[PDB]
Amino acid sequence: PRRAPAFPLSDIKAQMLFANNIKAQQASKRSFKEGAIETYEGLLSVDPRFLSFKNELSRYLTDHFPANVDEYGRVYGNGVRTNFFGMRHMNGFPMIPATWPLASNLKKRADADLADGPVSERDNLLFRAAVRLMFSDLEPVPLKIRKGSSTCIPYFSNDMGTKIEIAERALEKAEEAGNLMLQGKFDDAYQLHQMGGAYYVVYRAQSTDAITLDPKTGKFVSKDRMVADFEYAVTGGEQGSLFAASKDASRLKEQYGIDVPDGFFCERRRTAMGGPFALNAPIMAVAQPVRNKIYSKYAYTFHHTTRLNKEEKVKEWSLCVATDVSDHDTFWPGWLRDLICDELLNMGYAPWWVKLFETSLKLPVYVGAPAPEQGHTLLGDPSNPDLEVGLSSGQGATDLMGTLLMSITYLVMQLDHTAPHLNSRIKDMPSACRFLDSYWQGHEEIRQISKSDDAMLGWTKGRALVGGHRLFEMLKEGKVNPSPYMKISYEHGGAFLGDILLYDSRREPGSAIFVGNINSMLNNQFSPEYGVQSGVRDRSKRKRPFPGLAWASMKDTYGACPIYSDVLEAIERCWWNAFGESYRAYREDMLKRDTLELSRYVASMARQAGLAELTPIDLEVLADPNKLQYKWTEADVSANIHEVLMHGVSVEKTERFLRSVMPR
Ligand SMILES: [Mn+2]
Helix, strand or coil: CCCCCCCECCCHHHHHHCCCCHHHHHHHCCCCCCCCCCCECCECCCCHHHHHHHHHHHHHHHHHCCCCECCCCCECCCCCCCCHHHHCEEEEEECECCCCCCCECCCCCCCCCCCCCCCCHHHHHHHHHHHHHHCCCCCCCCCEEECCCCCCCCCCCCCHHHHHHHHHHHHHHHHHHHHHHHCCCHHHHCCCCCCCCCCEECCEEECCCCCCECCCCCCECCCCCEEECHHHHHCCCCCCCEEECECCCHHHHHCCCCCCCCCCEEEEEECCEECCCCCHHHHHHHHHHHHHHHHHHHCCCCCCCCCHHHHHHHCCCCEECCCECCCCCCCCCHHHHHHHHHHHHHCCCCHHHHHHHHHHCCCCCEECCCCCCCCCEECCCCCCCCCECCCCCCCCCHHHHHHHHHHHHHHHHHHHHCCCHHHHHCCCHHHHHHHHHHHHCCCCCCEEEEECCEEEEEECCCCCHHHHHHHHHHHHHCCCCCCCCCCCECCCCCCECCECCECCCCCCCCCCCCCECCHHHHHHHHCCCCCCCCCCCCCCCCCCCCHHHHHHHHHHHHCCCCCHHHHHHHHHHHHHCCCCCCHHHHHHHHHHHHHHHHHHHCCCCCCCCCCCCCCHHHHHHHHCCHHHHCCCCHHHCCHHHHHHHEEECCHHHHHHHHHHHCCC
């Protein structure tokens, strides 16, 4: 077990991060957040007539529109793969209590029996190769940072200039400080450079849940959310328990007294964590160029834009295999850290910085108020941290890790069960070089698309495919997973970033095609996550700028879903059945007001010039900036609002900085 030390919230270390101000001390002292999101301004999540609108919506429509994914998990028909009832929650009120994150799933990795290192030593070499290349050619470019992004841990300053001082001083003595950590002087850099420190628990909120109608009596059973307690946590999955949080709304018919219409539970309380940036500066400064690298040197498996972007790569394929990933974060191996740091150093990457990683990569955490009468438990010991808490959200390069080991285990498994004889062209580390290059160049029969956990796969004429069918079959059975690092199933109802690949009768990659999910659109409408906090002059702080945009963008967006317009029918209809009015004109006017609001926000798009400057994708990024923090990469935005969203960082300081960090 070995508890990760449970220091009281009160601690000087707890202070050193925070600016010891308003939001700082408050966040230290923060109570459990709760509150209906103003799901539309002038419209919370709680309106009962709108709740009946959900009622008609998910009921009458799922009724009319049952899912069309086949046995293989490959998709046909309407292309629905999902209950519409995932709307049906307190989508402003979280399902409570909450999990307590572990410190070591290593035994949990020994339960899923996830491997402690290489399968074959060849595989080791493979690891070393992906590492070899992700740690290879570099063309540094100026770093950039979100405007209005709170410094979070440490100080929680909203000021950009804070982030400036932090990141720049980090550019100045990350060497000295990472050395201090190598010297073990964690708190010295942590209290002078204020580098590193801790994570702060926050929430992702699953907007939906797998509500399941009961034919025999109409029960609406959302998927249960098994979660750890503090003991299951500190005793790395050892003691403690795994358990659903209460889904009930009557507990707010209790507490809030709020009326409880059918099927309306409460959104899942997934938990991200914030953390110090000064080390994330080197992270973006390289990875973002590395992002650009693989997107340039390769893309292919890597480029992510239009469904077209992907589809074109796909229908090509004789065979295609959407992936399905178990708890994507927690499962990341620490021996993987071992090889990371290994070949970092082997390839001259800066040992102090390497120490900086391992610091962050096992950085101490903190729990706020997971339930009322819970948390405010400081965790870990920033003097000898040892956490194996899995992929903490504070890193942005975690995506690199996911995309990594996933692509690994994918391709590997393809060797394992489709192309072992072909491993013969993988004679060594250099062979792994030409190869991996070529595979991310795609000049291979076995194939993939990848983005963190989400991924797919591909195959062709040439002497390897039938085993692809086989491995396909086994995984489709899922009866045993060959993967010793992950529980990777096929996703029945598989998709890639909401690109729901469709199949026809032939069920082929060349058959039917991706669609932008329309149910997902419904989510965008009604089951997203955040409110805006309208009580601020600038929307830059606001979680969710301009929803009306998505309205207009809808065909341009998820009109990729064939049945699109019928969805329009249903929405407008059900709204006339709801508030008895024009959600049409409603949302139109919301769009108009979006243009109004943005109008003063924007200059070069002179007055209300029109929205022609913004890509429909960037339009998606403007109704939805938020996924840019966990979907869109930064460069994607057109430079205008890109800068409205982001601010530049000096190329030079970062340059020489990398020159230090890089083996030159
Ligand atoms: Mn998808």
